[PDB]
Structure formats: structure tokens, C-alpha cells
């Protein structure tokens, strides 16, 4: 850890200039420029849309939201307890500081959506505590949570795992909502999904950049395993627990998209693709 420029003790840590890593700095600036608030998303004309939806379509979206309701919180919780603490590089901590801020806005946004669509308190509580009620989302959350408590796994392994959490675990639901946008539905859901994804792409790229700034990191095979594990969990989620069929989507093309996203991560990480499949959308 003492040979790690990213994790080793840094006395200049508390001051921003002079910049040491312009690559990390530009990452933070892109995030800064992407700032937005939940208030900026107009959900006035969305309750009616939720009404028009079909019983199956609402079942889907409600469940996608159930998982998103706590997902960003889990991420932030890892950033606070681990990443932002571990990393001693000023510029990196700035990026993580803004990511934390944005994850909470994301978290707020999903709560608003659920609040806007579900008026029944029974269901509301049900979806709000999905990590304790919906085994569908319980699995994904537990996967993420484990990496936070894992006091053995290295930052290298853990940063890769969260790159999967923010990329692969978001991918499936992201595409589904993009699908609705295509079909011209739920303008609130699709608009925030666009903003959130822009942040998500940044959080993922950064994770890969931190990876590159790591000297002693996991071997390729270990990275392929972590990524592949996330891929399978996500596929199981959107083809079994909550089939994209419910909203008119091919479960097979969805499975392929996830792998495509997985491949994008591997490249960003500096490795070869695993699946070698084109984006089916």
C-alpha cells in the first residue's frame, strides 16, 4: 500500500493546487459540469402516464424502481466508509466528493418517482424496503453490500466490483427505461434516467481510471470473474425475476446487451473483451 501513489500517505492531501493528476482532475470537472437537482425533473405530467400503463408494465417499472431506491445509497455508503477514505489523492477525493453528492440526488429522484406513482402506502413501504422484502433486488444489493464489508479484498478488486455495480447492475434497467422512451412513455422516468446515466457513465469511467492508477491490482482472470458474476446476476434479474417481456422486450437481446456493457468495461479497464457481442439495440 505504501508503493501505491493513490493509497499511500499524502501530506499535501488537504490542498488542491498544484494539481498532480490532470486526468483525474478533468474527470471531476466533467462531473461538476453535469450537476443537476431532482427539482429540475418535471413529474407533473406523469401520474396520468402511470395510469395509462398496462398492469404488467407497471409491475415491471415499480420493481425496477424498488432496486434503484436503495442502490445509490449503497454506493454512497461504500464511498464514504471506504473509497473516499482510502484514496489519499486530492483530485480523486474531489471526484468522490461530487459522486457522493450526486448519488444522493439520484437517491432522492428515485424516491420522488415512487412517491409520484404509488399512492398506496402499503405498496410504497413494500418497494422502499425491497432489499428486505423483494428477493429479486435482495440478491443484487447483498452482492454490493458484501464488497463493502469485505475486509480482505483489495481496493483494486473492490473498485472493479463497484464499477460492475454502477455499470452492469444499472445497464439492464437503463436499457429497459430507454426502451420506454422509444415507445414514448413515462417522460419523467425517461428524463431522469438520461441524467442519471450520464452520471453513471462517469462513475464507471472514473472507477476504471482509479484502476489504471493502481500498481498492484487483481489479475485479468480475477477481473473477468467479478465482471462475469455481475453479468449473470443482472441477466437472471431481467429474464427471470423481472422479465423485460413484461414491457415488450426480447429477453435474449437484453442478455446480450448486458454482456456488451460488460465488454465495454473490460476495455475501459485495459483488458480484452469477454463476450465479443455487438450492442443489440
Amino acid at each position: 500500500v505504501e508503493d501505491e501513489p493513490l493509497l499511500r500517505e499524502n501530506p499535501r492531501r488537504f490542498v488542491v493546487f498544484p494539481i498532480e493528476y490532470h486526468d483525474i482532475w478533468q474527470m471531476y470537472k466533467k462531473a461538476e459540469a453535469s450537476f443537476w437537482t431532482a427539482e429540475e425533473v418535471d413529474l407533473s405530467k406523469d401520474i396520468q402516464h402511470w395510469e395509462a400503463l398496462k398492469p404488467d408494465e407497471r409491475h415491471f417499472i415499480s420493481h425496477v424502481l424498488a432496486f434503484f431506491a436503495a442502490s445509490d445509497g449503497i454506493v454512497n455508503e461504500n464511498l464514504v466508509e471506504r473509497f473516499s477514505q482510502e484514496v489519499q489523492v486530492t483530485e480523486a477525493r474531489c471526484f468522490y466528493g461530487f459522486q457522493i453528492a450526486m448519488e444522493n440526488i439520484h437517491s432522492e429522484m428515485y424516491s420522488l418517482l415512487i412517491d409520484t406513482y404509488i399512492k398506496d402506502p402499503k405498496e410504497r413501504e413494500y418497494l422502499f424496503n425491497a432489499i428486505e422484502t423483494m428477493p429479486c433486488v435482495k440478491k443484487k444489493a447483498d452482492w454490493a453490500l458484501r464488497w463493502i464489508g469485505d475486509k480482505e479484498a483489495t481496493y483494486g478488486e473492490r473498485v472493479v466490483a463497484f464499477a460492475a455495480v454502477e455499470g452492469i447492475f444499472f445497464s439492464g434497467s437503463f436499457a429497459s427505461i430507454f426502451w420506454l422512451k422509444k415507445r414514448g412513455l413515462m417522460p419523467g422516468l425517461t428524463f431522469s434516467n438520461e441524467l442519471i446515466s450520464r452520471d453513471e457513465g462517469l462513475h464507471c469511467d472514473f472507477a476504471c481510471l482509479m484502476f489504471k492508477h493502481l500498481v498492484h491490482k487483481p489479475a485479468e482472470q480475477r477481473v473477468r470473474e467479478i465482471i462475469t458474476n455481475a453479468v449473470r446476476i443482472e441477466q437472471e434479474f431481467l429474464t427471470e425475476a423481472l422479465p423485460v417481456k413484461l414491457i415488450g422486450m426480447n429477453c435474449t437481446l437484453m442478455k446480450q446487451y448486458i454482456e456488451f456493457v460488460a465488454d465495454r468495461l473490460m476495455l475501459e479497464l485495459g483488458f480484452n473483451k469477454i463476450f465479443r457481442v455487438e450492442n443489440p439495440f
Copy 2:
């Protein structure tokens, strides 16, 4: 700690709705609405102003900046390692998430100022590492740093200490810069000082609000000690180490202002004033 609504285990921690504490929520929303970036501060017309300044006046400001250069970083470092981790209440973590984000912007801003005024690298490094070169600022920083490492002091005591760090330790330099604004000088310095102070007032109020949400907290006498200690350190800083006289200020009226700010904190905390002196400005 298990009887502390703020620090006890919370399973709903990862989700924002339903809001549990609207008072904490409104604090976070005020902060959100106050968002700004360093880029927004035009420093184009400030190098000339720095030129016009008198040798004594620059000596002052340069030293005030020396302390501000790492002060926000130290705060953020406590927020990450302690406060944001300790507190389990969702709304509080949102406020702390945004505070972290804003402290880094503050940190960036001070670095820009120094970068803008001091072209000589020798001096630059000197001021950038003031916590290791300037005993004037070394004392204040060490005071703050101690509360971070103190594994005995309670959150109650520690939150009070940082309320002093963000209030009393900022007060003296704040007033001095406000003084320059009055004299119509350093438009960049004074403009950012206004934005920063707006955030600072929020960080302080919040600290006091968290204090109120604490059940078992330090006794009044202990709060008076912590606050009084900070007051003296700040006075010593601006009447001995770096006399406000250098910019045409009465060292006695400055000492009184600090106590006035100290008294404001005590009230916000729910206690009686200590000094009972009016604002001399």
C-alpha cells in the same frame, strides 16, 4: 449510542423517502440551492489589485489564504472519516454529502486565489504547505486535526468542536476580508468570501442542529470550554501572529467580534451567551 436516533443502526438508511426529519431536510435543501463553482468567480481583474496593495496588506491576505488553503480539506477529511460515517440518518448524510462537495469547491477557490496572486513558486509552495511551515496556521490546523483523531471524545463534543472550527476559526479572516470589501479592494477575494461564508453559516447551523438531535451530549461547561478555547486561539491568531492592524483594523474590535460570533454559536446550540458583547462592526 443505541439510544441515539442520529447514531443508532438504521436499515432504511439507504432510501430517502419517507422523510423522517424535515428540519434536517430543509437544511440540506438550503445548501443544495446555494451551489456554486469556483469558475463562477471572475479573477481576471485581480492581479492588478494585488499589485496596488501595500506590502503589509499583501503579507496579511497571503497569510489568511495560507490558512484557508488546507482548512476546508481538514474539515472534509473529518466529514468523510467520521461524521458522514457515524450518522445513520439519511437526511443528515445528504447534508454532509453536499457539505463535502462544497468544501472541496472552497478548497479549489482558495488555491486559485493564491495561484492568481503569487507567481513566485517559492512563496506558493511556502503558503500551500503552511500547516508545515507557518506556525501561525500550524496551531489552528493541529487543533482541528486533533478532534479527528480523538477516539475518546464523543460525537457531541466533536460536532461542537467543528462548529467552532467552521465558525470561530473562519470568523476573524471573514471579517478582515469583509473589511477590504468595505474599502473597495480585491473584488475576487471579497466575492468568493461572500459565497463561502454563506456556506459556512449553513455548516455551522447544521452542526448545532445535529447537536440538538443528540440525546447524551456534553454539559454546558464543557461546551463553553471548547468554544472559549477556539476563541482565544483565533484572537491570538489575528492580534499576534497576524495583526489585523496590517490592513488598518483595530485589534481590540476584532477580538470582540470573535466573542460575538462565539456568543451566536452558544445561542444556536441552545445555551446562554458567554461574553455578552455586541458586534463591533
